[PDB]
Design a binder for this molecule. Structure first.
Ligand SMILES: *Cc1ccc(S(=O)(=O)N2CCN(CC)CC2)cc1
Ligand SMILES: *Cc1ccc(S(=O)(=O)N2CCN(CC)CC2)cc1
Ligand SMILES: [Mg+2]
Ligand SMILES: [Mg+2]
Lengths: 226, 8, 226, 8
């Protein structure tokens, strides 16, 4: 997208979202990132929404094909492998944008935490499909990214901040589903929920709605896990 | 489940 | 897909449908068609389902972008144009498969009607986005395909046959939405419904369910149109 | 509306 203006790429990403054209939306936002300027809060959200939709469809397809493969010529494995390779390619693309150079140029806590949460998520999606020599290393990469995000978030954000809350939610999912640490997942989700609940009194009506929506998700996991 | 994260 | 076996392409198209990977499903079925053998009833349905899903997403996106464009830089028109070009490319691809050589090799009425209904549908989707020198010619192409399908279907199929019913449904939509002929649309839908209703007594339970599902769609249009 | 036609 090198010949398109940054502002036009951002405008088109917004149009692509309204049209439910998430692959286009991701390509527009990748082009925007590659212009080399830092991203605003709204632009970070467009980038994240685009790729979460793309990889979400791939993950759902991969789970369907993997289930069929587990229940049973080479066609099912071949097709599962092609969807898997495509999913890994998208994750690698996102990780490459974060490494060149979104994270290193992100100095305030809001931006850096956002990108490190992304990094943990995309390594987590790689871990979901990993089986071999690098499954352990991929899991550690996800852990390290989430942990650094958590350390900054606890130092620099209030406990009701929605990015801090979503980070803790996803890290708890990492512990439960990837790292075989359900007790760590439960402890993290409970502590996060309780510390947020104690801070709600400081919030406006609108912020209260933002925070409680994510706190509910923590609760729904705790209900499924306990 | 994780953050849905699929709507801006 | 020239190096993949026909049977493997058909198997993978079925897997792609279960995974909701419709672009893949369409590419697998295009590969199957290009092997040059005629298609069975089940295979014709896989081809049709794949492309209807692909073009359906494009049409829905095009309508979102066209609405935004009508309500209002060059970005919205540019993006609507790119989605439009992609939609036209898919329609041209389907029409090319029908012309080389599905229709000419389709000698029994079931196959020929199925493919001519497809041809009418894909010209209808082209007509939905056409504005210029060829809008009239594209509309006539759709009309001619549907009309030939109708002539064969009335001669060779009972009035409850589901393909005959779906053809009449879609042709009535063509009349209402494309050809500015709502009375022709209403007459066709009413006559189709009534002649089917008079034939239901000949059907098994399963066939009765197949036919009445499409008759309901004719009724829902008649209710919206009258 | 036309045949949905999107499920085999
Ligand atoms: C990872 C993650 C956390 C929280 C959300 S949110 O609450 O839906 N929200 C955060 C802020 N932002 C601007 C209002 C939009 C999304 C999403 C993802
Ligand atoms: C164009 C069109 C007409 C009818 C259908 S159906 O009734 O859903 N059906 C026809 C036969 N076939 C095998 C049972 C599957 C689909 C679909 C499309
Ligand atoms: Mg510029
Ligand atoms: Mg062969």
């Amino acid at each position: 997208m090198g010949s398109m203006e940054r502002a036009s790429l951002i405008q088109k990403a917004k149009l692509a979202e309204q049209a439910e054209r998430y692959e286009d939306m991701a390509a527009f936002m990748k082009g925007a990132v590659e212009k080399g300027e830092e991203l605003s809060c709204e632009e970070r959200n467009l980038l994240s929404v685009a790729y979460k939709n793309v990889v979400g469809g791939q993950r759902a397809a991969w789970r369907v094909l993997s289930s069929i493969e587990q229940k049973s010529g080479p066609e099912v494995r071949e097709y599962r492998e092609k969807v898997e390779t495509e999913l890994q390619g998208v994750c690698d693309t996102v990780l490459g944008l974060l490494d060149s150079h979104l994270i290193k140029e992100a100095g305030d806590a809001e931006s850096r935490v956002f990108y490190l949460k992304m990094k943990g998520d995309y390594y987590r999606y790689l871990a979901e499909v990993a089986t071999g020599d690098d499954k352990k290393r991929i899991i550690d990469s996800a852990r390290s990214a989430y942990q650094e995000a958590m350390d900054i978030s606890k130092k620099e954000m209030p406990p009701t901040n929605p990015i801090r809350l979503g980070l803790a939610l996803n890290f708890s999912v990492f512990h439960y589903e990837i790292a075989n640490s359900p007790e760590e997942a439960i402890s993290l989700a409970k502590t996060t929920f309780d510390e947020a609940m104690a801070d709600l009194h400081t919030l406006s009506e609108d912020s209260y709605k933002d925070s409680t929506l994510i706190m509910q998700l923590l609760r729904d996991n705790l209900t499924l896990w306990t | 489940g994780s953050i849905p994260g699929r709507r801006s």
